[PDB]
Design a protein around this ligand. Structure first.
Ligand SMILES: [Zn+2]
Length: 118
RNA sequence: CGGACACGGACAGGAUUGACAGAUUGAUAGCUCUUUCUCGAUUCCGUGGGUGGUGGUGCAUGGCCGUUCUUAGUUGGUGGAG
């Protein structure tokens, strides 16, 4: 439970992402992105087959989560506030990590890759 | 758009920029249109809003200048006249 809860959220503050309706699946076209994350609630079953057709054949792995509404408070557009509303953004299916830039808590995402998923 | 900012919706399962071809036009303005890529949450729309103005009004004014006015005039205080 260490991989999905805490070691990746620190790699989501100010990195390079794929954010919105004209770029949810734009950053998959980049040969510059490391370990990404993917949501298991797509409306059509081939759009996730569309995006794993990039990564899983290649050197890139996805992490499953539930959906792109629990992912909304992670992507960067803050919707919840002291004087705010609960749901003013609906997040992406798949945001990628192109560069960590530092090594605070990144030893477990790379341990997530080649411990059992090899 | 060079209409800041504030309000909600449209913004991640397809908001907003740009652009070659061509019948497009005054025009190598992608203006529009057919076709179709790119840009990355910056925005666009709705509503209140500043804003800019060689737009009005010099009879609402400030500054300035012009003039009788380049001729020798103007004024209190303090007493006196009323
Ligand atoms: Zn008029």
């Amino acid at each position: 439970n260490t991989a999905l809860q805490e070691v990746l959220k620190t790699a989501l503050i100010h990195d390079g992402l794929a954010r919105g309706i004209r770029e949810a699946a734009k950053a998959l076209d980049k040969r510059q992105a490391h370990l990404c994350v993917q949501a298991s609630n797509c409306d059509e079953p081939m759009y996730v087959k569309l995006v794993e057709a990039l990564l899983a054949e290649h050197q890139i792995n996805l992490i499953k989560v539930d959906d792109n509404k629990k992912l909304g408070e992670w992507v960067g557009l803050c919707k919840i506030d002291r004087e705010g509303n609960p749901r003013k953004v609906v997040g992406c299916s798949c945001v990628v990590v192109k560069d960590y830039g530092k090594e605070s808590q990144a030893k477990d995402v790379i341990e997530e890759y080649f411990k059992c998923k090899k």
